[PDB]
Amino acid sequence: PTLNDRYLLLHLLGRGGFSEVYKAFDLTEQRYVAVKIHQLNKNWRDEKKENYHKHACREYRIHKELDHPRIVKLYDYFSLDTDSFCTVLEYCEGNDLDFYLKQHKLMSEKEARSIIMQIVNALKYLNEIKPPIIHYDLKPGNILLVNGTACGEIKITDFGLSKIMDDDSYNSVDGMELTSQGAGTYWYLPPECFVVGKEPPKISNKVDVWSVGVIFYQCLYGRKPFGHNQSQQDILQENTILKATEVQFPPKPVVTPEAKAFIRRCLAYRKEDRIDVQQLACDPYLLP
Ligand SMILES: Nc1ncnc2c1ncn2[C@@H]1O[C@H](COP(=O)(O)OP(=O)(O)OP(O)(O)=S)[C@@H](O)[C@H]1O
């Protein structure tokens, strides 16, 4: 059942919110790929059609140019009718870290560290690239365990909320104005992102550092460090992330105090006290 004159569709892999993902065989390259067929809507008409389209096309143009083994590769885009289009991706086996933590609750430190070093290498690449990127949505749902194991390989994905640190937007003194305040998953976002006032927050790649701290903590203890049993609307109501001034560690399971010291470096409340991605990428804890 072939698409774009190459793209022979084999079977379903999964469903997104408004998409279906098929395993396909790329007849020209002669490799297996994932075709994600985006299907909207017939009754959103006009306004919500085009800003869903440009959100998708924006993500596509960021993600297309990324070439690194710890980031899922994006091969192609093409439209079908007016109300649907496809993106074509590197075919990845296994499930994601969110699913893994549902089955197995937590993991070992050696395993949790194995994942974090890999994530950090992706972040180092995103901060070496042609205008640097903040991957604003780092979370277990966007970390694929491609070998089906925690000790094995991982890759990151989903640049829908990702901010571009170009010269118009960003400088190293101030950082960049937060574009779309309220977006993203609040457990993995830092305190500065929740301040509401006259002017929007100023952010940098230090929001990804906070995410890494939270994700690592979650892998070790099987619980999130802030707002564990709280919805998104609860987090905002209670300002639980603005109160996240000191991170506590349950006595079980045992983690090294070097691991705990690493988490405190990543989860520094005040962004000026927090290490940036460059400094995270040469953190002593992560040295082989
Ligand atoms: N590169 C890939 N390789 C294999 N399977 C994939 C790949 N990308 C997506 N899938 C499958 O598609 C399912 C959901 O697609 P995702 O795009 O990850 O979800 P989503 O972000 O909610 O989708 P939206 O809402 O349309 S952006 C996953 O559970 C996978 O099984």
Author numbering: 456 to 743
Original authors' sentences:
TLKs belong to a distinct branch of Ser/Thr kinases, that appear to be constitutively expressed in most cell lines and tissues, and they exhibit the highest levels of activity during S-phase. Our biochemical analysis has identified key autophosphorylation sites critical for its activity and indicates that TLK2 is activated through a cis-autophosphorylation mechanism.
The divergent sequence conservation of the catalytic domain of TLK2, when compared to other kinases, is reflected in its structure. Our unphosphorylated ATPγS TLK2 structure is in a pre-active conformation. Although the R-spine is in the correct alignment to create a platform for an active conformation, important hallmarks of the active state, such as the salt bridge between the conserved lysine and glutamate in the β3 and αC helix (K491 and E514 in TLK2) are not observed. Out of the 15 phosphosites, we can locate nine of them in the structure of the kinase domain, mainly in the C-lobe, around the catalytic and activation loops. Unfortunately, we cannot observe the residues phosphorylated in the C-tail (T750 to S771) because this region was not included in our crystallized protein. The modelling of a phosphoserine instead of S474 in the P-loop of the kinase domain suggests that this modification could affect nucleotide binding, leading to a reduction in activity.
